[PDB]
Amino acid sequence: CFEPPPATTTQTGFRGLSMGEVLHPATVKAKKERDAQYPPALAAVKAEGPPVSQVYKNVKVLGNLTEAEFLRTMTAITEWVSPQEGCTYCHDENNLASEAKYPYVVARRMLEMTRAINTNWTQHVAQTGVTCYTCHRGTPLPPYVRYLEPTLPLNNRETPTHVERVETRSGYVVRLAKYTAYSALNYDPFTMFLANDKRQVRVVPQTALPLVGVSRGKERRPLSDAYATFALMMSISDSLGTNCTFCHNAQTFESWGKKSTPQRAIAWWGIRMVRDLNMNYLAPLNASLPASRLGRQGEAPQADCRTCHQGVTKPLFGASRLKDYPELGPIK
Amino acid sequence: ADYQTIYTQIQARGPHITVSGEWGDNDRVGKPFYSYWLGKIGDAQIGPIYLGASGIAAFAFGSTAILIILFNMAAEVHFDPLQFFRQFFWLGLYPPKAQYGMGIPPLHDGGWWLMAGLFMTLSLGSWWIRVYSRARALGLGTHIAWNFAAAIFFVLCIGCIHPTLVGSWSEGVPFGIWPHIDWLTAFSIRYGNFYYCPWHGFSIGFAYGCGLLFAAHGATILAVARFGGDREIEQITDRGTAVERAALFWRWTIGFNATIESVHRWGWFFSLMVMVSASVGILLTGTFVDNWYLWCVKHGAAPDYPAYLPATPDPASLPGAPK
């Protein structure tokens, strides 16, 4: 039922406003240990010999690396994505230039996506960056992805209940609730807001009085947009293991300036980045995936805030490998 | 200590009294029975109950509304009885999610909600008639009915008057445990934080005052139960030492006092004002104010605070930012 004291608390607004984090140490420790499994950087290698564009036969992304540099990458990729499966997950034992296994082609696009993240989305990932490990955590299927309908459990490494299974219709409300921090909000924030750029998150008017011409009847946004934004915010908070005051002074959710923390701006960039990733890198990959990876509408698994963050306000508590693997970005 | 104020030490039994009303004396059904444990903290007699036309009409319409809600709820769990009990709190009947304006919504998107709203409203009106006419039948003033009227009026405000004034049924209160709760935040978020709505403030002021008054009034009467202060009607018409001491306790404490009758007017007025203030607030919201916080800023009332972590510009307004 309850969590024993003490609680760790932080301050994120002026004194007296009750803004800041409330954290259970046990829970933080369990997440710290889970995230400390991040494999350490492989030892640096001397840049020696010709570029692998001249040495190997089918190297389209990593072509400016030397042989030892490139094989160091391939070791790191195997550690991050398929340590249990090994190099043969993506490769033919007898022909390392064969694209015959689908993980090869996907991994190539993932290489491009990852460098895109570290080069074009520094407004969100800063100097910390991502690697394949950030999402994959040592398995080819990342533990936290989303379909065009809610699935349970959130961690696909756990085995679903009959009711949790997406085909059991009697369990839909619970599948939806657990994605919105157990609220009864009747909206799926992922397909509404993170799958594409079609919907506006902001719903609150920016004037005191209602403007004539947007304020009556069918000119009005339905109230459901406000439910939906709230649902997105429940989901976002739960995905970072935090509460609203991490980003907002609830005195005025819609105001910036002194009424928002810098984390709110970073979160804003995060919404745009996730949209780019899903629309332009992850959703097109239903062409290249087996039918057992796709959802009930032939969609590929896509990313939300939890995919990288897994319940922590900084993924892997700020761990970085950017300086150790320049080939993953940023790219000049 | 006066143990009588905690519970009845020695209970009494006697023949059941029936005060005759101008009509309906035969529509009292049931046989009275007595509960000894109830009788410790209250009156031991349960029943009979009057059973007029308006009361049955209320039960009729109410059950219809309940049934429409429960059926839609069960549809939400594909009629699995076990998941229905599990998920009961999270199940609901929703007004339209899409913007149809004031057009009648499809049954699958708000029509059933509108239906359940109609029958609940009829049930409330029917019960109101019961509350009113029962008073006149027994030769009593209609004070309760006018308080109850304000409470019904507030429900109509959040249920359909405010939707029709802004012109969208999408703004009604859903039916269900958690979902009617969720509406409060969706609404407050839409209209710019309800803490900054002065009529929220008024309503809360009166609601808190109802707690203050009933704690204070209840405590007062119990403190003068030894002189019979609970027999309030005859203390109104013939002031006894009970209400003299009650009046002097307050006068010597706060500098002024009520009478045994006027304290009930205070209480009645405070109760009424919870609902009247709430209704003015909803009637103004959406029709004439869009963001209550900005409205308080416009009129120079909102507090401001220093930044703690750095002030943060809206990134969407920086040059070259994506949409």
Place this chain on the structure above:
Amino acid sequence: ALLSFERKYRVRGGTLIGGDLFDFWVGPYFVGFFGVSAIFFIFLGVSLIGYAASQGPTWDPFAISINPPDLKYGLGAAPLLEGGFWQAITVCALGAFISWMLREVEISRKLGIGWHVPLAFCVPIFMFCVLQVFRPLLLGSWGHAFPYGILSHLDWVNNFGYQYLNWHYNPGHMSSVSFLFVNAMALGLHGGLILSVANPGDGDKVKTAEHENQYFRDVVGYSIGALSIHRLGLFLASNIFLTGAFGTIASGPFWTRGWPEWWGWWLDIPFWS
């Protein structure tokens, strides 16, 4: 000066401390020793509010705000301008409230009545302590307490709630809200009823105890009775804070997640999961 019936009650005695020294009235107000301590604390607190408010940005009453210290000062004294005034004012408040309660027991004794009213007044003093003293002790800073300002204290209630994503799902809150609602409803019913019996209108004659019970038996099939509604009303009102205090004390010290998630004890039973 005096109500027509007042003089025969204006007798010596009933004090708790000081005997005759403070046993007197000033206008309608009984004084007593706690009358004196109350005025002391009120004068001190209002002075500190005034001094603190003048060192602040504005004089608009809606925007004045005396705030507690940053969390980093823990449970220690903080500099006057940045939390100290809040600390001082808080102590005056407690002095004033407790003095006020004890003054009411003295008035009760002199009149030979029950102490029920100061007893009831303990509940809101207790709730004030839950918010400003006990819960900040359990968390380790006075910084978690609420600020003194007409509108600013609402911003604290606001953010405090959203620190647990949706406070409405707090079970102690649900209980508290339910008593606030039913208490306001009962007071309307009780006041409505009394007035309806004494004021039927039209020159009709005033009715009776039996009419009172007949009305509620007729409408809802039960009538708790005259004395009992007063006991119930004190019970209902008191439980707004008595049950609410659990939902407040729990948040932070005994629960750190959102309050919706707390209901997983029900939702996640394996039997129907």
Place this chain on the structure above:
Amino acid sequence: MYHGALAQHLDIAQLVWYAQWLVIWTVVLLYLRREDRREGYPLVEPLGLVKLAPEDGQVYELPYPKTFVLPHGGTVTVPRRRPETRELKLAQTDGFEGAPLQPTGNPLVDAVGPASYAERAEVVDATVDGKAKIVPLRVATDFSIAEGDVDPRGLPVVAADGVEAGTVTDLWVDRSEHYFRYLELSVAGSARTALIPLGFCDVKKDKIVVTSILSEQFANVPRLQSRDQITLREEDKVSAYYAGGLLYATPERAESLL
């Protein structure tokens, strides 16, 4: 353009704000606070001598009189002139305006301070249908003690000093509300009966404990006119007597507890 805007930086909600305060203060000041004054007004000063004309504020603070039509005949009008006639056996302890009064005699018999009774009608309170409301069980023979509960009839009454003071002979019941309000008891060694409000009674299974008065003080409990019914003023006299004991039964009860 804006819904709710008016000329020169006014909007409708701003006006309603003012109107709402005006409504509140009107009802509170001009209505409720005058209703509050239908008892005990006009106030009493160190002799209000101006018999020729009333002072203006005393007229302004009062509501128009209202008349109650009583259920068993009669009318009451409030407010009205009701000075307290009876001589009070109290003396001013000082010259100050709000200094307390002191009892000159025995305050329980003299009915001052917490022992004061109101001057209610010397009238028996009545049921809906005219009968006496508060009657002992010997008269109210269709009323019983509920099965479960002490029958006090026969039990002794122990006073504050631990002395048995009498024996409970009957319970008086409210026939309108089905609720016992008094015990009747014979005071031992005095050949008379006394009534006790239940609220002063600690009902145990072998005794009735009564802490408000001493055993000897049961002798001077106000007596009733009739044996089998009570008037509203008598109810006040009886109830007040024990309440006066809370402060007066012993010299130490009026002084500070600390």
